[PDB]
């Protein structure tokens, strides 16, 4: 959510319904932004994931409102996108088949990953289980580094 200028087209009619929902998200983000001086590394990353997951949830909310629930108007949605309450790219990915669930965009860039391949969270849990069984071990991981993703839930 950006800052209201003269160049900001004001929010259309149906925004008054949703404001308090995404307001909460905003508040959370504010809470999630501060020097919570985690000496630890893993926990520090955890905080970051809290922001990431929160972002996902907010965007996911707007996506739901637009597409699954089919409630809010198109203009309103557009406005929201422009203001960036919800990430557009993420939504686009969601709309595409296979990524119906998707933590975030960073988990599907094969360039960034040292092995030219997606984030392990994208591997469906069942597959991982199968692999583990074959090997003998259990699910080695619980959440990837890029975001707090205990499975990315393609299924």
């Amino acid at each position: 959510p950006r800052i209201k200028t003269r160049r900001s087209k004001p929010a259309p009619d149906g925004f008054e319904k949703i404001k308090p929902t995404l307001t909460d998200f905003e508040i959370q983000l504010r809470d999630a932004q501060k020097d919570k001086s985690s000496k630890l590394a893993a926990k520090s990353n955890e905080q970051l994931w809290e922001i990431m997951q929160l972002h996902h949830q907010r965007s996911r909310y707007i996506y739901t409102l637009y597409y699954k629930r089919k409630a809010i108007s198109k203009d309103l949605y557009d406005w929201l996108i422009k203001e960036k309450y919800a990430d557009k790219l993420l939504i686009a990915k969601w709309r595409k088949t296979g990524y119906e669930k998707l933590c975030c965009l960073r988990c599907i860039q094969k360039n960034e990953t040292n092995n030219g391949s997606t984030c392990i969270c994208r591997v469906p849990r069942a597959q991982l289980e199968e692999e583990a069984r074959k090997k003998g071990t259990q699910v080695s991981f619980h959440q990837c580094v890029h975001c707090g993703c205990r499975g990315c839930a393609s299924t």
């Binding site: 997951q53 996902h56 949830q57 996911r60 669930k101 998707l102 933590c103 849990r125 069942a126 699910v139 619980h142 959440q143 975001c147 707090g148 993703c149 205990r150 499975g151 990315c152 839930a153 299924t155």
Partner: peptide, 23 residues
């Protein structure tokens, strides 16, 4: 694999949505 097995098993994750607990 049966798609109802995945339906029952994706509610076993104690958290909602992307972060599941899976125990």
């Amino acid at each position: 694999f049966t798609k109802s097995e995945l339906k029952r098993r994706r509610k076993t994750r104690k958290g909602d949505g992307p972060w599941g607990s899976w125990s």
